[PDB]
Design a protein around this ligand. Sequence first.
Ligand SMILES: [Zn+2]
Ligand SMILES: [Zn+2]
Lengths: 843, 193, 105, 231, 62, 290
Amino acid sequence: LRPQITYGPIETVDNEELTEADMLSFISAAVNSTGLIGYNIKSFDDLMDNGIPQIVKQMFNVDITYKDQRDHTEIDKLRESVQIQFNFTDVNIERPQHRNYSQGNKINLLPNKARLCGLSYSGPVNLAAEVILTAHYSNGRQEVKRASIPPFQVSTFPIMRGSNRCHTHHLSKTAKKEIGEDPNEPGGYFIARGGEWVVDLLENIRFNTLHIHYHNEIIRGEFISQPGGAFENSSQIIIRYMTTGAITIEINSTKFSKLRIPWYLIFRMFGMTGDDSIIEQVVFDLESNSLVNTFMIEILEKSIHVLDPIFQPVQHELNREKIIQFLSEKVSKFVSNPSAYKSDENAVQYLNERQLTILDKILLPHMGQTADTRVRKLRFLGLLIHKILLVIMNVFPPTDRDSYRTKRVHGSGVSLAKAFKAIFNTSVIAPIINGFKELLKQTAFEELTQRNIIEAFSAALSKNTASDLNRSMEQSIISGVSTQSLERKNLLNTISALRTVNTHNSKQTERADMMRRVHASYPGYICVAQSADTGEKVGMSKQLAITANVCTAGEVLSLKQRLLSDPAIQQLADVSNKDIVRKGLARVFINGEWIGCCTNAFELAQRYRMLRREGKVVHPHTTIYWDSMVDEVEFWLDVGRLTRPLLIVDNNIEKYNQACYKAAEARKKGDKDWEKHKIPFIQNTRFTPQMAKDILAGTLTLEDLVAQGICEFITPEEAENCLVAFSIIELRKHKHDVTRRFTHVDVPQAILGLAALVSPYANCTQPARVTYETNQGRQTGGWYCFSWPYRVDMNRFFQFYNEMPLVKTIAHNYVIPNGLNTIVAYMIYGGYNQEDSVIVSQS
Amino acid sequence: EEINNRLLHGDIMPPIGLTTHDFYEKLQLNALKFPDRILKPIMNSINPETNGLFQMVATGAKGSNPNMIHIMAGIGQIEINTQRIQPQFSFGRTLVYYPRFALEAQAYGFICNSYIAGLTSPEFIFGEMNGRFDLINKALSTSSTGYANRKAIFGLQSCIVDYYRRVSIDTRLVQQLYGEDGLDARQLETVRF
Amino acid sequence: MKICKACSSCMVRTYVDGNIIFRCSCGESVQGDSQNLLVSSKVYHTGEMEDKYKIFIKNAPFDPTNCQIKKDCPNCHLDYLTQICIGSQKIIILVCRCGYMSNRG
Amino acid sequence: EPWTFDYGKIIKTAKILDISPAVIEAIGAMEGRSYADIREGQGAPPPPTSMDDPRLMAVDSAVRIFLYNYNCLRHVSTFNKPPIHVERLVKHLSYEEKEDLEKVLPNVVNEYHTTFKHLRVTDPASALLYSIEFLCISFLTLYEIKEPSWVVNIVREFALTELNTIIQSEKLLSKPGAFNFMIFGEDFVCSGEDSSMDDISAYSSPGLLDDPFSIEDVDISLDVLDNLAPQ
Amino acid sequence: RYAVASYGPTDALTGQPLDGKRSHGGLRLGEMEHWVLTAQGAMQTIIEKSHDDSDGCISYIC
Amino acid sequence: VAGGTNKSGIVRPQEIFSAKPVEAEQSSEMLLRLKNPEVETNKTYAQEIANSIELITFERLILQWHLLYETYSSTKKNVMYPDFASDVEWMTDFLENHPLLQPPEDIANWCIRLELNKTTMILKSISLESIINSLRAKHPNTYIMHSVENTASGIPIIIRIYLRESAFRRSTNTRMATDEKIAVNVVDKLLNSTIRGIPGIKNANVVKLMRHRVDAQGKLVRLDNIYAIKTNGTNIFGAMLDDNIDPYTIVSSSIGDTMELYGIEAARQKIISEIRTVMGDKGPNHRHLL
Ligand SMILES: [Zn+2]
Ligand SMILES: [Zn+2]
């Protein structure tokens, strides 16, 4: 679609009265849109309403078969196996409950009772299911028994305080205050065993992207693929280039492990067995004379004729069926004797059908999971090998591990889902599987009724399992999913702990020093000053900048269908590899999935950015990245991106360019006054002093500043297509500078976190000293909690008197100040204040 | 800027053994150093008889001359590992505030302001880059020294002065005479011949 | 490489009495005439060659993050150009959105 | 040269093998269907519309294993030891005439590869039929030869053996019947949709000598670490 | 701050004081303190602290 | 922290205390004093000697190389690669311009084609005849052809080296090496051939140093106008063979190299000198380095 809105001319915007104190209002607006920790509550609510139900109803289908190990006992000789098949149909989570006295009716459990009694602020999880048992007989017939289970409670799931499933969500501020809660705190923590725990934000690499690293391995390329969504299973491929010349593609998933396969065998298993076509997926053209192709063809050709010790029998095979059979026998763990099943033809058909089903769900699942996308995956796989060889050729550098262009920040919703998956199938699925095994061993299959099947499912899930799910989640929350105990030194520390970004858990000396530095991709997203000043943790824990936020997943289907309805984008089925290179087409990606090509990458990204400004067609939180180095357009809508609002800067470069042509045209016509046809260049932001006043009156929010096309959200990968003026004073200095045309204008205070904004005139202090204040401001005595009398806390200090600084900062609009305006004399008095000591008045 | 004008016209020719990039960086690092005359305005603004900040520095009690210059005149060029700010922000950009292949000195860590005047946002970021190293190297100076100290002590501790003033390992000579003069290091006097 | 005309496989190259013979695993053998007399090759300074920056240099006038210079374009007579500095020898190229490119490219 | 699909070649080829022509037309489309339903032709997927249809690559893969195995018989002498698929029939021949079979046998790979790459991009519907018809025409060519008399009995068996194995390989990708699940050697047998025995470590993010920052050789109390503050 | 005693809780295995304030044990004269005391030649202080005040005992050897 | 001069962190101290070999040194240096006290006064002589010793391998003068399976006979038309069939124009010129350099009778069927980097040939000031003479002197089992020294951009300078059959006759009893393996191994040897330098040293600057000397009247005077060469990289034996360097006062920063050539007593003095350099000027007493 083409953008249809128009804005008033930028030459008539009146911003000469704007002061840098007026721009602070913009920051205020930003902080009022996202709150301070609103992403934690939003992420946990997304996990509750959408995440866990999807995970249980979609990713936990059980279909297993077991040997019938009974005795003669009638027809039991003629039955060999029993097939346990079940899935869960209904899922929900309720608010935490407690049972009063004994045999009560499960009254509500408030957070303060959980804190005092050492209880668990966990709400019940109710599941429903249907189970299908199949018995297989020697002659060939089979019998099916199907049962349906009424909803039952498996365990309790921890509830984040202040979230939707918290009791302090249906209560007012006065009611919150009177039940022993801190009426001013936002929440965002878990209460387990009477302690408060913060599930921290975790740095992770970006999924559906290729990370190429140097290391026997010459080079390595890793690609984690997720079929779309925050809670789907991810499968990674590692494409190694070994010193022997061999290229091996290792696939790690829930079904494979550590098995390095020669690269061309993956192509053969999908039906592409011709080498020339296999080579064409990497070089895109066998008839190109480019020196890049000569380099790649020489490497690819040598890799085909390198002998793999494991895949020797099928290395020279052109029959795709016999390659699938070899790998299925190689990776299936129930095949303990080879050639014992090859005498049975239906068994060979079973292993081949099993491998194809597994292959289409773990090999690049983000490109599709059906069999209709096999050749599409091979085109994408060849593109990945092409990129990796471009780094071996030293054409392109490897991936920067520190840049946030290729990083994600995952909160409690994502992290608790990963812990839930590894726990649900251990504390729920595993007991049920053992439950049905022991029923079928002690009772004939045909003697069973609906009652017996329904009883075993509930009986096997005893309170051993009910405890197991809740306590395994708590241990994951406590042991740290990177978590920490919530230490309430003061209100600044509590907020700074919930805005903290932690890295996973190396020993490489250069790798250990680089990850602790401040990176050029930080300004506006990660506080440049907040870190530990001493110890191993210097630079290891990061703080969100004041206007930074964490994105949620967007409607990927709406954008994908619009890109596929775009006349400017050719679908991937309608273009050849030769067409891409001979016509110079530009690949278009959405969330890493290659969907098509366009003839003009810059024009498409420019056109969809203008569609995002209206917001009616493209969501405002959509990342639009144009790679001018390789001419690719990337759309990102996934959860975990850091964004900040930036005020849009507009110019009159269209009229300025036209006036240059008219002036040149007049000069060629012999006119003497050819210079009077030029017009001055003008660039400005549309933010006016009246907008600042409307923000403070509450009648203008960040939502309608975005809706009016005045500011927009920028992600660290989209920030590489931006030229930002560091302040409104720098934008005014270059108002008529045609040689420096900014895309956005920044508010200078947006580069600091909340604790670093406590320091007054921080730009007049040595910057390393501002790092100290972030540590020292978070360990300062004050009103550590507003509900302190209702708490029994350990090593907590409540300072009685606090003062607002005479020289305050914007950080004191969001946290209570902690300290006093002491009168200080800067003098030598007897030598008792030397070497960093002080003299205090006893009075 | 005159170095940039030479570069834009292709007038910069490196000597043998240097690339044009390395020579241009050598010229830019040398051209962006404060002269000695930077203290003329600093010293014309102060009274040495009464200024406490100057007296703490001039007498050696606390501080140095670059401390006064940074506070009062200007910080200058941020220099990490004896070189300017390298572009880690997407292939030729040092930060999001500067364009690609920017030629101005400010884009590579030149801080034109003093502390008393305050730094701008890009200057504070470049200053935070330099100040983060001081914290990283301090944390490393404990562990790296500890690894080297323990290996040096376990290699050297068996050396003990015997009754001949020799240094030996239980019988075996390490030195024929300790320090080749047989003296204690706490008992030495610096004397002119 | 050489591609087998029968099974489209990558043939193995051997040398017999001063001639190149491509033998496949299916028994088919051919002899290259002229285009197969390239045993190996390498190209140096791949990170700064003109073939690497073709797309970038073509896209440079449209990238808003690139440095501009106050200098007339001699083709369309626009009063500003986009300056880029590529390589370890710091090669300066001026480009314009009209297609002009200093160094004649 | 105007090429058109000829359905008579599949009819002729199928009658030789005593199989329904629906089996030949369903090469590369046998996954997800029981071989019974394939044989009558029920549930036949529609003709391809995309050049990235896996059906096109599957039938092309079937063609080139017929050509690859044919040249192994055609070049049986050049092999140090011929493969097992050809040696079991050329065993009784003599090395003089085993060196032969490359001058008396036709070359049936005339213009397949060049034409398939043209039709696949242009119209994927015709690519499926061209490669299906080519496999039948090539099989007939090795079947309808008459001279010399000493070679007719040696390739007609070969043509029947290869085309049967091509169909057999396609058949092994279809829906399995009923069989004992314990012949694999273990008790448990899991399916492709099962998640009961998934790797626990695979739910995390996949994948990942002295610590330079660890105070391991520094013997300092953990309660007094503020002595190391940069100050 | 901390100051303990001539006596107190003792580890069952090593026979040395427990660790720090919370266990009411002693404080640690670590590896680097014995380097400094050895460098100074103060060997009767090492006997007093590492033997008399920590775990010094009598071993009988044939 | 740059490669070849890495002195960041604790790296030089680890090289000394771990007794690491010369191959593991990331900041090795060397100070060379000119053999002539008269030459050491003038900087131009010190500068041209410093640039005289700087390892320029044949590899760093190359933009691209191709290994071709071709033989050269002047009369019979032999097959040539289609991309480089245009090279025949300067083949004929080379043969009529070098009547003494006729192609031999034992040229093998292996050819190496080279495309010299003209910018490096200008920046390093290396002539074509300097390359050709250096390659012919070191590699006698090859036949070398080249184009003219052109001063116009766009026309490259092509070095074409034909392998003689004697290259494969050197050691062919070791049958585990196909002719392609020897030919490729010949490429590696030829590329790594030394042109105008000593091996092991990367950069050789010129430094001004002050030394003491006794006058004819007995006075001791500090002479500040003395020029030396501080190299980047260590090769004592390579500098010991130079006639522009005083061999008796070669100062290497490498303990392993000093121990190798001079002995344990000089290596003892080298450990003292190298620890003191790391220690700074607020350093320990000399008896703690001893
Ligand atoms: Zn072949
Ligand atoms: Zn122009």
